[PDB]
C-alpha cells in the first residue's frame, strides 16, 4: 500500500 510511483519504462510485457 501507500503512494505508488510508476516507471512506465519498466512495465512487464503483455502476454
Amino acid at each position: 500500500n501507500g503512494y505508488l510511483v510508476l516507471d512506465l519504462s519498466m512495465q512487464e510485457a503483455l502476454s
Epitope: 510511483v5 512506465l8 519504462s9 519498466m10 512495465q11 512487464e12
Partner: antibody, heavy 114, light 110 residues
C-alpha cells in the same frame, strides 16, 4: 495533455555549472519517475539517470554520478538536472522523459566553449 | 561493457511491413531488459513508441508493435506510412542503468 517543457538553450564557459529545468504538465508529477538523457554527436544517446519525484531519491549511471545532480520541486512540478565542472565534451542536447518509450521533453541544447 | 546494436539503415515502401531488431553484446534480450523504443524526427523531436517490450504508448498508431524475436528485441511496423521515415532507437535495462542502441535510419520511399 502531457507537456514536458524544458528550459532554453544555454552557452557557458568550461569549468562552470548549469541547471536545466523540465516542467511537467498534464499528469500527476509525483506519480511517475523522470528520466534524463544526453544526445551528443560522438556518443549518440546516453542515459544519465532517473529521479523519484515523491521520495526525491535519484539514481545515476555510474559515469554521470559526479557530473549530474537530479532534484525536483514538488510545488511547481519541475524536475532539475545540474551539471558540474563543464567541459567541451559536455556540449550536447539534454532531454527529460517521463519514460523512454513515452513522453519526452523538447530538449535543451547546451554549448560549452571558451 | 553492455553494448546495444541496431541495423544502421533500413528501407521499406508504403503499405509494407518492416522489422527493426535490437541485440545485446552480453547475452540474449529478454523481458528483464524491458525494451523501450523511441522515434526521432528531424530537429530533435523524440516520440516514445513502445515500453516494457510491447506496451504501446498512448496515441501511437497500432501499426507499431514491439516483441522479442529469438534473442533480440524487435519493433515491427505493419503497413508503413511515409511519415514513418525517421530514426528509431531501442533502449535496454541492465540491472541498474539503461543502454541505447545506435539507432536505425528507416526510409519509407515517398
Amino acid at each position: 495533455e502531457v507537456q514536458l517543457q524544458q528550459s532554453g538553450p544555454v552557452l557557458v564557459k568550461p569549468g562552470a555549472s548549469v541547471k536545466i529545468s523540465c516542467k511537467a504538465s498534464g499528469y500527476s508529477f509525483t506519480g511517475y519517475y523522470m528520466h534524463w538523457v544526453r544526445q551528443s554527436n560522438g556518443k549518440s544517446l546516453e542515459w544519465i539517470g532517473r529521479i523519484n519525484p515523491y521520495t526525491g531519491v535519484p539514481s545515476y549511471k555510474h559515469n554521470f554520478k559526479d557530473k549530474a545532480s537530479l532534484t525536483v520541486d514538488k510545488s511547481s512540478s519541475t524536475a532539475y538536472m545540474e551539471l558540474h565542472s563543464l567541459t567541451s565534451e559536455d556540449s550536447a542536447v539534454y532531454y527529460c522523459a517521463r519514460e523512454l518509450g513515452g513522453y519526452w521533453g523538447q530538449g535543451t541544447t547546451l554549448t560549452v566553449s571558451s | 561493457q553492455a553494448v546495444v546494436t541496431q541495423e544502421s539503415a533500413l528501407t521499406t515502401s508504403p503499405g509494407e511491413t518492416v522489422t527493426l531488431t535490437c541485440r545485446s553484446s552480453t547475452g540474449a534480450v529478454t523481458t528483464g531488459n524491458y525494451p523501450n523504443w523511441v522515434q526521432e524526427k528531424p530537429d530533435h523531436l523524440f516520440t516514445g513508441l513502445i515500453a516494457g517490450t510491447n506496451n504501446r504508448a498512448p496515441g501511437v498508431p497500432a501499426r507499431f508493435s514491439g516483441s522479442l524475436i529469438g534473442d533480440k528485441a524487435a519493433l515491427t511496423i505493419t503497413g508503413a506510412q511515409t511519415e514513418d521515415e525517421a530514426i528509431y532507437f531501442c533502449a535496454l535495462w541492465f540491472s541498474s542503468h539503461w543502454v541505447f542502441g545506435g539507432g536505425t535510419k528507416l526510409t519509407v520511399l515517398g
